[PDB]
Paper text:
1 are likely to be caused by inherent properties of the cofactor.
Denitrification is the stepwise reduction of nitrogen oxides to dinitrogen and is utilized by many bacteria to replace the terminal oxygen-dependent steps of the respiratory chain under anaerobic conditions. The reduction of nitrite to nitric oxide is a highly regulated step, since both of these molecules are toxic to the cell. In [name], these domains form homodimers by interaction of the 15th β-strand of each subunit, which is consistent with the SEC data collected during purification (data not shown). 1 [name] [name] adopts an open and a closed conformation, and it has been hypothesized that these states are linked to the catalytic cycle.
Numbering used by the authors:
A (entry chain B), B (entry chain A): 4 to 543
The structure:
Amino acid sequence: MKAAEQYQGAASAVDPAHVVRTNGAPDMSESEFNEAKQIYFQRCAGCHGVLRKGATGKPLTPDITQQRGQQYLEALITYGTPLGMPNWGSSGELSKEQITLMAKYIQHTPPQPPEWGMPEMRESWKVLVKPEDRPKKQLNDLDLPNLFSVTLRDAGQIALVDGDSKKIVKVIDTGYAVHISRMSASGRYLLVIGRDARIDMIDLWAKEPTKVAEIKIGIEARSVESSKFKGYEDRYTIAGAYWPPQFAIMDGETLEPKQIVSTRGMTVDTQTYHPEPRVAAIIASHEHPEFIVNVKETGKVLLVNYKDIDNLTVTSIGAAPFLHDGGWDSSHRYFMTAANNSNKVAVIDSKDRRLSALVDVGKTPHPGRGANFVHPKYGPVWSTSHLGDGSISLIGTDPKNHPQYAWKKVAELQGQGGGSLFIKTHPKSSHLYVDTTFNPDARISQSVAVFDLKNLDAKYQVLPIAEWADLGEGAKRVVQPEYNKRGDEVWFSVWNGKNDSSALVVVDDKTLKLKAVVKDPRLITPTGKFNVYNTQHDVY
Amino acid sequence: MKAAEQYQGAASAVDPAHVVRTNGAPDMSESEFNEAKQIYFQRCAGCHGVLRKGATGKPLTPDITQQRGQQYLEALITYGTPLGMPNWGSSGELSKEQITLMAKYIQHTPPQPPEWGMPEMRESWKVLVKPEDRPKKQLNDLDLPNLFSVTLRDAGQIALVDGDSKKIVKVIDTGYAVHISRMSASGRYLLVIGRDARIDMIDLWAKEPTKVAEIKIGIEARSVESSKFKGYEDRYTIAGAYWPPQFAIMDGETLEPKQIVSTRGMTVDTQTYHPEPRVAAIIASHEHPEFIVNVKETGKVLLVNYKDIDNLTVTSIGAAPFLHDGGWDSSHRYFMTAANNSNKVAVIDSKDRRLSALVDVGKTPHPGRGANFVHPKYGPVWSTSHLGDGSISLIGTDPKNHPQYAWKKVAELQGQGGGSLFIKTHPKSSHLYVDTTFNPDARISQSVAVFDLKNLDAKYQVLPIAEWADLGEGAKRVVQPEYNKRGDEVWFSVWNGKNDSSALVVVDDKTLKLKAVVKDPRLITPTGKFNVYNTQHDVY
Ligand code: DHE
Ligand code: DHE
Ligand code: HEC
Ligand code: HEC
Ligand SMILES: [Cl-]
Ligand SMILES: [Cl-]
Ligand SMILES: [Cl-]
Ligand SMILES: [Cl-]
Ligand SMILES: [Cl-]
């Protein structure tokens, strides 16, 4: 009756005088609030995050913002900061009236976007073609290993480009602005994820590659990955979300949602609670049946063991805050990940399940998956490009046979300048390609630098990738070099405007000569290109 | 710098129109809000939680509460429901004007108490006596294994009573309303955790037992535990918190804070995010170097492996919502814990790291640690009483030599009625005791039922514990039977008010006749009683 009521009726130990109401912000209309909120996610949420704690420095919470004041915040938004906070008034990007509204907005409690659990996922889950009715053999005659999965960012779709043919073979509708493409261990299924957290599974064996499953694992995402460990091929596919701060494990044949795990938790450096730790790069392990999951704001690398997904076991490894992209080393044991805004590179030992070291590097490293090669003096190494730096950092990745040079910034190369984004090579190649996508100089932003590994002390050659495309108007930012299955050509993307004309430019790695140019009215804002074989077997 | 700012300056994939502002509640003054907020934690937070999502039914969040309306909520609060929601108007416990305020308060966004990270812990952390300054031998002449640690709830302290002398040997100030007492594997250090989350470690080898370390792991807590795996004795001490939803691991010798882990995460039944999953019972594994941690609202049981404390591995086991108290079986392998308000008992396999079964029992089981004995027909069993009915459930715990009765509610026993909290026995005892602390009948609450393991079909005997104390005015509620080391005597608390007289009653287990009554002006609101040896070695 009420005996259990009296049992739990005791007063909470929490002192009510220490629980506080959240107000004290300047009055804002409903129309005004929504206008600043539209600006925040259009211009600010990328760094500061949904809850405004995703960047360095003091956060944009009420207690902090109200302490500064209306005019401090207006002043700091108008003129920015030399530590990565741009200026929105001096640049003319925002208006005096708008900046005033932003200063008022961040003094209010940050509005919350909704959660996304199993009910939301299962409703988003669609098996368009059931595995029973899927082909048992490759129907088409495509040379799938040398297929490129090219992202048509603004078009909300992806294009399959036959490597040798240089022609588009199909265009598939996907989530908006796909970020990466990943292959299943079998090589039959192509996985793509949009920044809106929609995943699509493509069957490369159908008469024409078709989608077979679909699911939305959140509101904002970046990464997807498939199980690579011996015996667990196509068993499970993982995907991490920016919001909600979580990742999800799904069946690898149907994408059925199985498990959802929150990444909300304590940070490695300060060991305080963080309400929005965004999941970034995910990579499958060869040593154990685990997914190595990067968690950005908390600086944790998680080892998600799918041996038993009903009773999940996770090992949380401390590294450095702001974990971002990364990739394997030549051995496929040591996961080199870039804690970009910590200017460090963490080394995750997938075998011993620990952090091998933290390597100091240049200003904001950005390697993507990186580039591995054998240095004459320093043995095997792993290299990264940089955004705030024009440098290239080489890191020893050979502890067994090169303890002298291991997890050390053994040597630097210098590229065309800052704004670099991806560094690329190939085992069969003697060159090292470095793009300058976000360099503020036009010429540099549409060129790439090529180093000669045969003689590494020489200066690089500059290749005019955009010039070779002969597009015309547009910024024509070049981005992301990728090799073919055979390794003797290097594909480039000219990330021109949505309403301008773009292209993919293919270079002969043997001669460093223009080999071909890919143009098509369907190839809108081409960004990421992913060779099936090279991506599937971590060739980089 | 602009390079990195353009790279991370892309608009968020989050639609601002789907990120909504949280204020549509009826206006309240600051004086009125703080009065309703005070009643909430004084009367309601125990069940509904800090964020109003800890009870069954629909939560008291703005979206739901505003939908009902002011008149609906006033009525429901005024009258209640027959499903665990007490009456507050018919009761006459809250005035008509307070209920109106409470109805408005729960329509506002719930106020939030602060977090409690490593900085807050370290400043709260005190080492009163260094390990170097502690004795290498037991200075005092006390029979430590037979000492009782008695909680003096309202006095904010505990008393150490000598089992055979029946006298109080010292009184030690602690956190407010200590909840449990635990002993180190070495049996030298007594650990007590306050209702307010303050932990005190007591050295029983000093000339007089003195506090040697102190730490606050949160704002509200209930549970504390020590590592009991071979080779890891006294190496780590763990404690769980109600708020913030987290647990923490400290050094066993100094209580230095080492790690903090957030229990915020997804539930087991709906697989949705819960922002306040408060930690409940915690027990130390013998099969592996792990802590078994109960997480209430999410219904998860976490196996926290301390093999490597810097890289913490945690297996998450699903069970049923509202996990609470629990205990070992006779084997010390299967953790029998009760999801109270799910009316089930979960069996967690300490060895295989999985859920062996979910057993349906009575309304709101409350076992504490439980009571193990050998049923003449059904083999080794684990028993529990309930709050919602006078039932006593027996559950087989022998899968090796009694597989047909394993994890089955093999039989039921009837006590005096509902409102029971603790059932007890001893390996050297022929009797089985059940209390009725929260029974609404005065005499029932003052008595305890006693069963005969030699003849289970016989009706219980009733011993009037409070009557035997001869205390006078007061509710004189009796609670928590506890044996001594030799199992000769059974101790009971008479949990009277702080301005009334209380006592500890001791009964001769071999004869069931009163053996002693402990009265003392320092014995204020005695609740928990913890024999050092029986608590240390999990004898129940
Ligand atoms: C987590 C993450 C990965 C690795 C996932 C993995 O390995 O599993 C990744 C890699 C990538 C890769 C993989 C290339 C590779 O070599 O693997 C590409 C092409 C890429 C195109 C872009 N990224 Fe990416 N990217 C983010 C996050 C990520 N970028 C951002 O947070 C940021 C700064 C904001 C955003 O706009 O998403 C960001 C900006 C960009 C771009 O502006 C690019 C150039 C175009 C776009 O669509 O946004 N990111
Ligand atoms: C999590 C938890 C444990 C086990 C910890 C472990 O094993 O590591 C426990 C066990 C206990 C034990 C251990 C006895 C045993 O045999 O193990 C005792 C004496 C006890 C005295 C009370 N408990 Fe307890 N108790 C709660 C939580 C807990 N009770 C509540 O949430 C609730 C309902 C609210 C509250 O007031 O704290 C609650 C009410 C009570 C009481 O009213 C008692 C009788 C007096 C008091 O201090 O509030 N609880
Ligand atoms: C990165 C791509 C950013 C974008 C886009 C915006 N901000 Fe930012 N901000 C950023 C960093 C790395 C820092 C801290 C660096 C430092 O030491 O200054 C900041 C700082 C602010 C602050 C100051 C908070 C404080 O320290 O007291 C405010 C008030 C702020 N930022 C607001 C803001 C607004 C309104 C933006 C767009 C409308 C915005 N920022 C964009 C990184 C980035
Ligand atoms: C247990 C010890 C409780 C205490 C003390 C309080 N409440 Fe409660 N409440 C409880 C349960 C188990 C339920 C659900 C039962 C059901 O019939 O659904 C509730 C329900 C409410 C509701 C209704 C929510 C809804 O579905 O709309 C309200 C508005 C509510 N409770 C408020 C409330 C207040 C204001 C209290 C003290 C001041 C309070 N409750 C105490 C459990 C317990
Ligand atoms: Cl579609
Ligand atoms: Cl955590
Ligand atoms: Cl393993
Ligand atoms: Cl979780
Ligand atoms: Cl082990």
